[PDB]
DNA sequence: TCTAGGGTCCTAGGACCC
DNA sequence: TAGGGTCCTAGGACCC
């Protein structure tokens, strides 16, 4: 009762995107990020800045002191999402069993799948193959029983190659897989693990369900289950956006409502635009605003609201402004909308 | 170096219902 | 009849 899950994963997906479309970037250090006077951080870079510690979510300013040469890009949303639905379509031609997870990546299901002779390695091989023939992007693939294990097998052969788990070896695999390489388990629940004396599968498989449930909750049991290579949640094709956000982090912090007000002026008509390429008549669950402030404190409210309205976005930044701000910088306002629920 | 913008999921207290 | 459900809401870890 093995299933046969592909976890594939475009390789330095935005900046792959602006090498083939502008050969020029191709061997010199590049990333797709905000500048550092405008205060951004990198989306991701290629192999030649990524030699130099350039990393994604770290800060532009840190990614240039460490790479002086970076070549720093916007971002053409469009392209990257022209590419996504090219690979998806790709997928498509294998099985329907596609859960993407973002633009340049998905899981797939393909136990019942009579391509290749049932071979999930050829497949992946051949779905990477074609990525490569017809987007002329490269593409890692993660082949694995479970999601969670093929996600972290696509990592291990990047660039432009994949790495295949299988119920035979998962059990040497875990034994020494850092905590920190599960997906959901970052830098804060690493560093609790840490202290407790836990840092990897094989640690956690020494513990006890009741303890690991009483320390961390719902994540203790997922905890202990990932450490056994239990991760039975299926591909789901079927999930739906949630929520729609616009915000903006201003070059200088501002101390006035007139120019938060300003700014919101230029973030509704945005938010306004993407929630209609979703649903035209503008009906939501909730919305709301949020606020960043100069210390890097960061509030929210939101509150049911039956449509889209400006006025009443602006009234609530209004008073999350007066209310809670204490004569802070703000470095960041946004806009906020829940989607109804089907 | 100085910290983005797109999101998902979980948690928790009080309101509210019974 | 002392407590059991289920929304509302804010915050925060985490993901890409
Ligand atoms: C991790 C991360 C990705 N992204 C964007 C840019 C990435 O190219 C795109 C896909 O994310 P990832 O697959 O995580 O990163 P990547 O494709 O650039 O690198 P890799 O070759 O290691 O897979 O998502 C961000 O904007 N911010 C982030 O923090
Ligand atoms: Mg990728
Ligand atoms: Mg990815």
Redesign the pocket.
């Known amino acids: 009762g093995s299933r046969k899950i592909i976890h594939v ?2 390789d330095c ?1 935005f900046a792959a995107v602006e090498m083939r479309d502008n050969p020029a970037l191709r061997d010199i250090p590049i990333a797709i ?2 500048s ?1 006077e ?7 870079a290629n192999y030649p800045a990524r030699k130099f510690g350039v990393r ?11 790479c002086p040469h970076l070549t720093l890009l916007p971002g053409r949303f469009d392209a990257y999402k022209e590419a996504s639905n090219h690979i998806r379509e790709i997928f498509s031609r294998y099985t329907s069993r596609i859960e993407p ?5 998905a899981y797939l299901d393909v136990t019942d799948s009579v391509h290749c002779h049932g071979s999930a390695t050829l497949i992946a091989q051949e779905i990477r193959q074609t990525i490569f023939n017809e987007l002329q992007l490269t593409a890692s693939a993660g082949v694995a029983p479970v999601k969670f294990l093929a ?1 972290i097998a696509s990592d291990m052969n990047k660039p432009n190659g994949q790495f295949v788990i299988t119920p035979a070896e998962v059990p040497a695999f875990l034994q020494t897989l850092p905590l ?1 390489k ?11 693990l840490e202290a407790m004396g836990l840092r990897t599968c094989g640690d956690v498989q020494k513990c006890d369900l009741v303890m690991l449930l009483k320390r ?4 203790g049991r997922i905890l202990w289950e990932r450490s056994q290579g239990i991760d039975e949640r299926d591909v789901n094709s079927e ?12 070059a200088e912090d501002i101390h006035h409502w007139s120019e938060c007000e300003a700014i919101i002026e230029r973030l509704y008509p ?1 938010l306004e635009r ?1 929630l209609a390429k979703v649903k035209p008549d503008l009906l939501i ?2 919305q ?1 605003v ?1 606020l ?1 402030f100069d ?11 039956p449509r889209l309205n400006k006025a009443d976005l602006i009234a609530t930044a209004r008073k999350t402004w007066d209310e ?1 701000r204490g004569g802070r910088g703000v ?2 306002v ?1 806009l ?1 909308v ?2 109804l629920d089907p």
Not at 56 to 66: D, H, I, Q, R, V
Not at 239 to 250: A, F, W, Y
Not at 295 to 305: G, I, P, S
Request: proline share 2%; aromatic share 6%.
């Open positions: 994963d475009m997906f990020g905000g550092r405008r205060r951004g951080v990198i989306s991701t994604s979510a770290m800060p532009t300013g840190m990614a240039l002191k460490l997870l973002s633009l340049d990546e996600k920190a599960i997906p959901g388990v970052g830098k804060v629940s690493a560093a609790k961390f909750g719902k994540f999930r739906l956006r949630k929520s729609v956000g616009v915000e903006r982090t201003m945005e993407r669950a909730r709301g949020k960043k210390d890097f404190q960061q509030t929210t409210q939101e509150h049911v609201w809670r470095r960041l946004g906020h829940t989607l």
